Ligand binder design. Structure first.
Ligand SMILES: Nc1ncnc2c1ncn2[C@@H]1O[C@H](COP(=O)(O)OP(=O)(O)O)[C@@H](O)[C@H]1O
Ligand SMILES: Nc1ncnc2c1ncn2[C@@H]1O[C@H](COP(=O)(O)OP(=O)(O)O)[C@@H](O)[C@H]1O
Ligand code: NI
Ligand code: NI
Lengths: 188, 183
């Protein structure tokens, strides 16, 4: 398939460019976005392509790596993606940083990778990276569960992503419960 | 007196932070009560053991004598100063009843939900992967964390370790659902 080859092209590029926004996160989010897209009857090629390049423009990437919108667009077109599809992908990644149907799917997959056991891991790695405490202040990893991560299930766009988020969100709840036991007074 | 030690020791992005020390002193003190240890010794040794650790950097790392002489200055007896110094030197060298308790407290804080957290904080602080290397957080579970339960000295610690260990397995199972092909 033209599309399979183009997906593969995009994957190698994205991996090359990038090598909590590492290739492994992007690859997980692409796989998850395609699964949700399939269930949701969204356009699979747009979902996967947007999922793969969504972080390339993100203000969080260091400046040796981060791309301009025109750089992503030109690379897509060079790789054989029609201008119309390329426009749609561009619409999604710029909105992400009403989102389109496929944009909502990608956003959902992205938020799913921020919850469950994976999201817990990513949260504590971030805290470790930025020199924040495990708990004890408003910049802490534990605070971030309450400010953000535990609310993500309410922000899911699709039924499919809402269904997947349930088990992950409940698992974060079990994780918080275990921290409350391992560490009496953690909340105060 | 234990209050004057808690102020000084408070005065680290490596896994040897204050919250960990404070956690482990409270745990040590709890375990020590069950295992009939000298609670003042346990709390003090728990509070100061990391100060001389070779894993702690040069800019912070204190010498044994500095720890001894600071303790004596806060007004500790020679008896208890020697016992504490005994404990913290036995724990802290390269290729490492009151010591057992302090060691158990320390190990326990490396497992369960809390240990998961510190492992990932560690991997983040040193720039290591979530998974994929032998140097990754996920690898450390199998290399170290999942076998800590079988290195516990006291009955009390062994019992506490069970639920923490079982939870780490639940965590790892969820992670394998979240990340297909993580192995
Ligand atoms: N204040 C915080 N404390 C702990 N983890 C965080 C914090 N902010 C973001 N994270 C986590 O770090 C990862 C990277 O997030 P970030 O780069 O800030 O936004 P995004 O990944 O959505 O572009 C995500 O899993 C996110 O949940
Ligand atoms: N390779 C690793 N990956 C993830 N976490 C680690 C690794 N090595 C140590 N840690 C974590 O950092 C903390 C401190 O461990 P370490 O300094 O090795 O032993 P100790 O402090 O008990 O002498 C612990 O929570 C431990 O699990
Ligand atoms: Ni992302
Ligand atoms: Ni320690």
């Amino acid at each position: 398939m033209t599309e399979l080859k183009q997906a593969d092209q995009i994957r190698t590029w994205v991996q090359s460019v990038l090598t909590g926004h590492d290739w492994l996160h992007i690859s997980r989010v692409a796989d998850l976005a395609v699964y949700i897209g399939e269930k949701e009857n969204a356009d699979l090629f747009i979902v996967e392509t947007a999922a793969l390049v969504h972080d390339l423009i993100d203000v969080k990437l260091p400046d040796t790596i981060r791309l301009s919108v025109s750089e992503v667009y030109n690379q897509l077109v060079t790789f054989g993606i029609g201008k119309e599809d390329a426009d749609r992908v561009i619409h999604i990644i710029t909105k992400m940083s009403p989102l389109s149907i496929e944009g909502k799917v990608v956003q959902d997959a992205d938020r799913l990778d921020a919850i469950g056991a994976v999201g817990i891991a990513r949260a504590f790695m971030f805290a470790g990276a930025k020199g924040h405490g495990l708990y004890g202040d408003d910049q802490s990893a534990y605070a971030h569960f309450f400010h953000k991560l535990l609310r993500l299930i309410d922000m899911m766009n699709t039924d499919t992503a809402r269904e997947l988020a349930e088990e992950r969100h409940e698992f974060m709840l079990q994780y918080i419960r275990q921290l409350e036991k391992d560490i009496p007074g953690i909340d105060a």
